[PDB]
Swiss-Prot record:
Family label: Belongs to the universal ribosomal protein uL2 family.
Stored Pfam families: Ribosomal_L2, Ribosomal_L2_C
Subunit structure: Component of the large ribosomal subunit. Mature ribosomes consist of a small (40S) and a large (60S) subunit. The 40S subunit contains about 32 different proteins and 1 molecule of RNA (18S). The 60S subunit contains 45 different proteins and 3 molecules of RNA (25S, 5.8S and 5S).
Domain of life: Eukaryota
Keywords tagged on the record: Cytoplasm, Ribonucleoprotein, Ribosomal protein
Gene Ontology CC annotation, any one: cytosolic large ribosomal subunit
Gene Ontology biological process: cytoplasmic translation
Principal location: cytoplasm
Subcellular location: Cytoplasm
Species in which this protein is naturally found: Candida albicans (strain SC5314 / ATCC MYA-2876) (Yeast)
Protein name in UniProt: Large ribosomal subunit protein uL2
Alphabetized PROSITE patterns for the sequence: RIBOSOMAL_L2 (PS00467)
Function: Component of the ribosome, a large ribonucleoprotein complex responsible for the synthesis of proteins in the cell. The small ribosomal subunit (SSU) binds messenger RNAs (mRNAs) and translates the encoded message by selecting cognate aminoacyl-transfer RNA (tRNA) molecules. The large subunit (LSU) contains the ribosomal catalytic site termed the peptidyl transferase center (PTC), which catalyzes the formation of peptide bonds, thereby polymerizing the amino acids delivered by tRNAs into a polypeptide chain.
InterPro entries, alphabetized: NA-bd_OB-fold (IPR012340), Rib_uL2_dom2 (IPR014722), Ribosomal_uL2 (IPR002171), Ribosomal_uL2_C (IPR022669), Ribosomal_uL2_CS (IPR022671), Ribosomal_uL2_dom3 (IPR014726), Ribosomal_uL2_RNA-bd_dom (IPR022666), Translation_prot_SH3-like_sf (IPR008991)
Length: 249
RNA sequence: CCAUCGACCGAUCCUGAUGUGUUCGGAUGGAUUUGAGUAAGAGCAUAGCUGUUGGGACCCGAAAGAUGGUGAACUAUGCCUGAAUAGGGUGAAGCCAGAGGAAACUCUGGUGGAGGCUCGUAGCGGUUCUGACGUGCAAAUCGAUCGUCGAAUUUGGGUAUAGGGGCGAAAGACUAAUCGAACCAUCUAGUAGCUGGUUCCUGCCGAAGUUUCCCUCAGGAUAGCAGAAGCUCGUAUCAGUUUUAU
RNA sequence: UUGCUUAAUUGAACGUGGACAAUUGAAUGAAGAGCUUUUAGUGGGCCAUUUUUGGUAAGCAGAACUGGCGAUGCGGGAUGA
RNA sequence: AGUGGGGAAAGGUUCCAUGUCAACAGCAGUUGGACAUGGGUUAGUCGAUCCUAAGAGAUGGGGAAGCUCCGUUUCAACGUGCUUGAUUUUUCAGGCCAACCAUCGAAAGGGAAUCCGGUUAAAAUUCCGGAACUUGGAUAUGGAUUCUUCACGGCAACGUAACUGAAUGUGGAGACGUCGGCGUGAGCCCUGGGAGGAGUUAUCUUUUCUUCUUAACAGCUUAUCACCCUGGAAUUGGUUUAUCCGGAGAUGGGGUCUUAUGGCUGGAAGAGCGCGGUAAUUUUGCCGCGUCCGGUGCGCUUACGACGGUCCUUGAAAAUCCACAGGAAGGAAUAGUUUUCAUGCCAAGUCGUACUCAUAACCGCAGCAGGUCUCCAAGGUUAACAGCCUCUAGUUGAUAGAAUAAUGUA
RNA sequence: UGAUGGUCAGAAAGUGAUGUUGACACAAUGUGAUUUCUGCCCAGUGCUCUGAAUGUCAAAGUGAAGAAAUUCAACCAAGCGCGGGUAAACGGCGGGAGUAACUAUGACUCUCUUAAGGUAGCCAAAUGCCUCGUCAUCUAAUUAGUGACGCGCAUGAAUGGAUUAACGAGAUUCCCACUGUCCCUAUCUACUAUCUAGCGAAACCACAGCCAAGGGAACGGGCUUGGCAGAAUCAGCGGGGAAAGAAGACCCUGUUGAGCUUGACUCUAGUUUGACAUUGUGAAAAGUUUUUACUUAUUCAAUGAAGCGGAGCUGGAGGUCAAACUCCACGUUCUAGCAUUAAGCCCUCUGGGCGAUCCGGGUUGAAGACAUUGUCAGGUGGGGAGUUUGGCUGGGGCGGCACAUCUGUUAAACGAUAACGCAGGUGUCCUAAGGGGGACUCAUGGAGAACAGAAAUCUCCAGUAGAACAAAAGGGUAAAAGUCCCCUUGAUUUUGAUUUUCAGUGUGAAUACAAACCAUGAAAGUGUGGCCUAUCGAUCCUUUAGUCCCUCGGAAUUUGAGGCUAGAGGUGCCAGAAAAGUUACCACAGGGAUAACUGGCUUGUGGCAGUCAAGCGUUCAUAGCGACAUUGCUUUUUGAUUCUUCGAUGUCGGCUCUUCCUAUCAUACCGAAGCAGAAUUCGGUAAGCGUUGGAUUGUUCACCCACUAAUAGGGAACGUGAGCUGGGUUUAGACCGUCGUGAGACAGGUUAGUUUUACCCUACUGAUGAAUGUUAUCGCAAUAGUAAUUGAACUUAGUACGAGAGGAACCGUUCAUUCAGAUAAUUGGUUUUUGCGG
RNA sequence: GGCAGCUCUGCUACCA
């Protein structure tokens, strides 16, 4: 047969992300002396739309502690953050929406976003619109914090990892139907080349494991082993179960 | 030279003398066994015809396979930067005014100018005539008719993706008139039990389509049938026939 | 002659020596008999008489013997392997 | 929405003049994109050149037997650094920084600066005449400023001929989708008077057609929006085609600003245009007159403006230029400073530039009914940039003659 | 899938895409707006989940034996197995009988059985074979359409079920309007064609070009026999040249491919699991293993390597029970401002210290001897690679085995002899069912004997085998070859010869001896498996036995290995490859050795016609029929065959047009009747002449409606595609149902799908034309062609005939149908009269 | 043909 559409994406010729209009990478500040020992104050200059992103971004200006210079940061805007607001980041920052605090400095039940998986990676968890991270508890002896991720998973993170207080702005986006193929076209025009999708069952046997037949049908189980190889992993990969989800999981 | 019975040498089997590193030796006598042997050498070398095998292999002929390269001037898709798209119809929100109601609210007239809306040009496409043409104007065009015509629109240029690879709103489609695996050169005079051809004269002889074996059944080998060279001899004793006896 | 065989001096096989001469033991014929090497093409067949199997039959399919066509012209069957 | 006038790609001399007809132009040929000989493309301002885009790609490194692959500042000791006071001791003294930063990548993106009239057989935003502009450099005079050293005025918005300002920093411009109606301008269309020229005139027609124009650049003036001062608003008012605004200060009164756009003047009538009268084999003219004053709009095209709608779509970058913050350093009185005020001086290299752009200059074997990106766009009819007729411009090219059976094609 | 990640890329990499990303995300799939719903099944195949105990279980490692190679054993990862989950995973979703005060049905019951047995819905639907289902409606008539019905070959629920407004160059039916689509054609215009001047190709071409019949490769231009036959030609035309275009694309063959699939054969990138290495330093506990401590190897990340680690200054605290130890902090939080090139103090040294605490120069985190990487080892791996996927055959395929074989027959009295001929058999079975010896006689019948009878056991007689001998059939056998008894292993050893098949090769099987050693019998003798004819297997490799022999090549010993001779392990496609599919996307070499048309032979079958005459026909065989039988014809059916064509003869039907046949439907003339008339039936000469308009269907066929004198049947390459058309079939797109794991299949349904060339020769239709002294006019007529057809009305006549009911015909008259040949008065149509008007 | 459990199921192995 032929190389299937799954495998052509790794080469990344026409499958790279369309990034001309993007407004910068959304990251926290580099963890420095001020954030480790006290707090540093910045001011929100802009709240802007980032193409390909549901969450708006905030442009926050900080002073450089060591040279006469202004540093502009690109944060993910939490809902309620406004232009001209003062943003405080550090160990001694107060528990206000938009402030960046270490996870150990936040009491249980604190809603936090753009949380660091590892100390200083500048934000990994809960970055999309309407999403957040809940702080479950602390383990001060081991310097660890328990959090709940938007997927429902419980994670143990260093208490020195940082997060931004509040919920990511732009939530409720999925509640409205797109209603049109053109709307999805414009949605993916600034994301990547993944739309529209032809069904593999509608192809020929060269194109896909599902192609061929005198009727459109998969022919074999569409649940594929985790240990299958590239060109085989088309369908439900390592599916623990199938069918309509009934009851609680 | 022919037929036949013997003899000798080697192997195999049997017997087993004087003797002895007591386990070796193997005299002697045998055997419906066996060798491409001995039995007063015939070979070696050169050349010629014919036949054989490997080689391009009598000549021309695949569909394929491999190695290394060249193409995105067509086209497919993404990206970057530009450009293009008469005139109408319909009349969404929002807004103004009036009327009715206890309230919750309702009705009417305007205004407004929404929509992968609609009629319809340019444009883009290509339904039907199964029209023309069909050694064409044209290796896809011409005419009428038709789809769509403000967006998933059309399009220039730049740029990216390269052959078991790309790209595909998916037809095995498109990837320079080439695609169910492009093009170029080479391996390569690839192999072919298959098709075609195979060049002067006369003289003499002259077939087979049958046996057996074969993944054998359009092919081979084998035996037969045929030619050539002769050799040993010269009526020796043979015959697709009869008779007699059985 | 033998180591085979017989109760044997019997036999078996192969012999020495002697006799039977062209009517040397039927016909007819005999461009002579015997022997060897090597190699070609072929290995689709078909037809006629007679015998014969399957089939309703077939210019059908399958065997037997012979003769033909193939490979072959010539006279006849008008024409025709 | 051309058979008009230009261009991009592509071609490459096809351009122009002269000669010329063997071949080619599927008839012809005296003609030609054919053949032969010559001629022809003029730039500081138009492009390239420079910038960065998607991307391409050296170096330091790391793979790979290797051809080479990855990577693009990457695990790198990465400046052929600058700015000054200089020194004439051709030595220096230092003062700042070195995040990022090889390079290539657009004749449609960004971007310093030019227009009009004339001129050739063929070139022209390139030549000639005149009139400007930008950048780089040099540099003097005038003006400006200083004894209160680095100017004044205005309540203010802000004004001006000028009117210090290093390192470093902050901003702005470059720099940005699309649609809808509205408003203003420009060009075109329409039209009145007057001064000319042409046409019709049996009859009619104070008639029909036509000329009456004004570049870049310089000065003054000119605007929606926005802003300032005054004042204090319900009986709410102002206000758009579109309902938004006002105690976070409306209406009213008075001002400030951007100069898009228009007006006046200079450029500039001397030019061009339209007439009339004369010169002459005649290179080429010479003379006179006029070139003026209006109006109109759901008009067309286009530019701009203030608005409004739209998106799970929010619609490049960089070079480059400026301003501001900062206060380093240097500054006067018998004299000091500055080329962001005026005037004056010098220079601007290299390459492209002819012509076609298509029913004959490109690609389809060809002078092929195919294909190939874009700009300008008159009158009538009309909803209309449709169809139909016409003006300017351009073509009249496609073998032809004679007949008019059948069968065709339309 | 929470980043030490998922998905994907790369030969590798200090390498990449998603990713300027972070579950409202990225990646992978299925279904396909809305509405209403998405039932039951986890047995199968997948996927997934745990492993406390656990079958299998690689390399390394461990233990034992051995002189060692080596062997054996224990242990033993993942995987598999075991257990669970999962269908909006792949998928699946049953049969048989009885039953209700008529019948029908079966609410109900019984019975087999599954993982579950098709739920809600829907339907002769694009899915139903039968089938043109049945009913209704639509029409004059409907294989079409629509509405119902439903034991539905084979409907059915995100392999989505049922609906559905709007939309559609999608498929279909009906109605109005409209019309040359048609009845049924006519006329007009331009451009061709045509003729001329100029210019000027190509396809194609063995030679060529008139027919009929024959034979012939079974459809001739040539050959044979006939008809005939007279220069040179022009415009048309499409009968023929099995016309041209292309080494058939269907079919088969080839030890030719390729695309695709899978549980084919053989591998493989990747991935996973173990071991060793990288790999070091400690502690503890289990018997080397487990755990956790260190950091410097290694790995991850960030930064313009900016503030790390420890200690000390300052406050806030503990209640201080010595003496200040322990803990915390140690300059910034109403506001969209500002923060940059140190002030100040101290020592003098255009400079140093403090401001700005000291010390360690570890940039800072994470991770850590685990990852990672290298090398082996096991698993997984149609993602990919390579290859394979018998033969015969009345085409192939399916079936069968006629593939190694045995008996009888075919088989034609030696031997041999074929077919997918006929009736059958073999892949075994037997320590006796082998060998020897001895004794006996079998099947069956009759006559007798308690229970006892047709069949128990006993007795006699008869008994040529009518029994038995392992198994097919044939042969053979009587003091035996059969039955019973006794003893045995000759079913042994060595190696030759011979017979059959035959090449006089192998294999199988068998025969007669030689040399041994035995069994049995008194002995002669017999015995080298089965009474005879079938009952079976090479090279290479392995294994065993024998000889204990030969060799391991520098010389030895002992292991091990290799030789020699004989068996065994097996090839059944049986003289003996190691082997799954699909192609409707297809390719190549060929084949008329071979299928799908026509043609040819045949004529079973189809159709048609005779002979006989038992019966039918009130009686009566034969007016008209005619059983049981029997003889033919035809080639308008379908078979059978495979002769022609596979370097191609265009394969359905219709339209159009001509001709022919007769087995005559009508029309002319007649004979017969169970012929009164009328009608009808049977028959003769007869093909002169006609044989229709429509609904449904692609249809041939069919079936209705209707008219008619009648609505006969056929042929001409199943006439006729360079005549058309293209509805069907039968390329490639797509849907459904059933089948298949799948790619895919269906001779099932459905929808969309390029129809090319004549200008040559001939033939046909027309048109000229040399020369028969020239020219003109008028003629003759050989030969060829030929043409008319049918009905109605009136009259005869309400007559003949007839009980009546009914009810003709000839002569004649007027019209009409179909056809033919003209013509343009009239009427209509046509208009470039561009004539006139608008 | 090896293991192992309940006459036998499961796993593993395959040069005539
Ligand atoms: Mg989707
Ligand atoms: Mg899809
Ligand atoms: Mg498809
Ligand atoms: Mg596949
Ligand atoms: Mg699969
Ligand atoms: Mg499939
Ligand atoms: Mg489907
Ligand atoms: Mg000799
Ligand atoms: Mg070749
Ligand atoms: Mg090749
Ligand atoms: Mg190969
Ligand atoms: Mg291109
Ligand atoms: Mg419009
Ligand atoms: Mg067209
Ligand atoms: Mg056509
Ligand atoms: Mg034509
Ligand atoms: Mg149109
Ligand atoms: Mg492009
Ligand atoms: Mg297909
Ligand atoms: Mg192509
Ligand atoms: Mg050759
Ligand atoms: Mg062959
Ligand atoms: Mg001879
Ligand atoms: Mg074989
Ligand atoms: Mg042949
Ligand atoms: Mg030979
Ligand atoms: Mg031979
Ligand atoms: Mg043959
Ligand atoms: Mg021959
Ligand atoms: Mg002869
Ligand atoms: Mg003769
Ligand atoms: Mg004859
Ligand atoms: Mg010229
Ligand atoms: Mg010419
Ligand atoms: Mg000429
Ligand atoms: Mg020239
Ligand atoms: Mg310029
Ligand atoms: Mg330059
Ligand atoms: Mg870049
Ligand atoms: Mg390097
Ligand atoms: Mg550049
Ligand atoms: Mg440029
Ligand atoms: Mg731009
Ligand atoms: Mg530009
Ligand atoms: Mg000029
Ligand atoms: Mg010019
Ligand atoms: Mg000049
Ligand atoms: Mg002043
Ligand atoms: Mg200018
Ligand atoms: Mg002026
Ligand atoms: Mg425009
Ligand atoms: Mg100046
Ligand atoms: Mg020019
Ligand atoms: Mg053209
Ligand atoms: Mg070319
Ligand atoms: Mg225009
Ligand atoms: Mg027009
Ligand atoms: Mg022409
Ligand atoms: Mg003409
Ligand atoms: Mg699904
Ligand atoms: Mg639906
Ligand atoms: Mg299940
Ligand atoms: Mg299961
Ligand atoms: Mg092991
Ligand atoms: Mg295990
Ligand atoms: Mg049901
Ligand atoms: Mg049904
Ligand atoms: Mg149907
Ligand atoms: Mg109908
Ligand atoms: Mg019906
Ligand atoms: Mg129905
Ligand atoms: Mg079903
Ligand atoms: Mg379901
Ligand atoms: Mg279904
Ligand atoms: Mg509907
Ligand atoms: Mg429709
Ligand atoms: Mg559409
Ligand atoms: Mg003609
Ligand atoms: Mg014949
Ligand atoms: Mg003939
Ligand atoms: Mg012929
Ligand atoms: Mg003749
Ligand atoms: Mg013809
Ligand atoms: Mg013709
Ligand atoms: Mg062929
Ligand atoms: Mg073969
Ligand atoms: Mg193959
Ligand atoms: Mg292929
Ligand atoms: Mg650091
Ligand atoms: Mg390790
Ligand atoms: Mg695989
Ligand atoms: Mg494969
Ligand atoms: Mg076969
Ligand atoms: Mg079979
Ligand atoms: Mg046979
Ligand atoms: Mg065989
Ligand atoms: Mg015989
Ligand atoms: Mg056997
Ligand atoms: Mg016995
Ligand atoms: Mg016996
Ligand atoms: Mg006996
Ligand atoms: Mg023999
Ligand atoms: Mg045998
Ligand atoms: Mg014996
Ligand atoms: Mg030796
Ligand atoms: Mg040695
Ligand atoms: Mg054996
Ligand atoms: Mg074997
Ligand atoms: Mg065989
Ligand atoms: Mg054989
Ligand atoms: Mg098929
Ligand atoms: Mg044949
Ligand atoms: Mg017949
Ligand atoms: Mg018959
Ligand atoms: Mg009777
Ligand atoms: Mg045939
Ligand atoms: Mg053929
Ligand atoms: Mg033909
Ligand atoms: Mg042909
Ligand atoms: Mg007759
Ligand atoms: Mg008759
Ligand atoms: Mg006739
Ligand atoms: Mg019909
Ligand atoms: Mg026929
Ligand atoms: Mg026919
Ligand atoms: Mg024809
Ligand atoms: Mg045709
Ligand atoms: Mg069709
Ligand atoms: Mg099809
Ligand atoms: Mg299935
Ligand atoms: Mg179509
Ligand atoms: Mg009467
Ligand atoms: Mg007529
Ligand atoms: Mg007129």
């Amino acid at each position: 047969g032929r190389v299937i559409r799954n495998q052509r994406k790794g080469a990344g010729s026409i499958f790279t992300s369309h990034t001309r209009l993007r407004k910068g990478a959304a990251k926290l500040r580099t963890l420095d002396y001020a954030e480790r020992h006290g707090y540093i104050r910045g001011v929100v200059k802009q709240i802007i739309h980032d193409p390909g992103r549901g969450a708006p971004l905030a442009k926050v200006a900080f002073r450089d502690p060591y040279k006469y210079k202004l540093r502009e940061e690109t944060f993910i805007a939490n809902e309620g953050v406004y232009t001209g607001q003062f943003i405080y980041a550090g160990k001694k920052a107060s528990l206000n929406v938009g402030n960046i605090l270490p996870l150990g400095a936040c009491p249980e039940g604190t809603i936090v976003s753009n949380v660091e998986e590892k100390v200083g990676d500048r934000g990994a968890l809960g970055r999309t619109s309407g999403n957040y991270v809940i702080i479950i508890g602390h383990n001060p002896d081991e310097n660890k914090t328990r959090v709940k991720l938007p997927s429902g998973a419980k994670k143990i993170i260093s208490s020195d990892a940082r997060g931004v207080i509040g919920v990511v702005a732009g939530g409720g986006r999925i509640d409205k139907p797109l209603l049109k193929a053109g709307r999805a076209f414009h949605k993916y025009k600034v994301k990547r080349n993944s739309w529209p999708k032809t069904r593999g069952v509608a192809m020929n046997p060269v194109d896909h494991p599902h192609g061929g037949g005198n009727h459109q049908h998969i022919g074999k189980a569409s649940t594929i082993s985790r240990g299958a190889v590239s060109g085989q992993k088309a369908g439900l990969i390592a599916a623990r179960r199938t069918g309509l989800l009934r009851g609680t999981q």
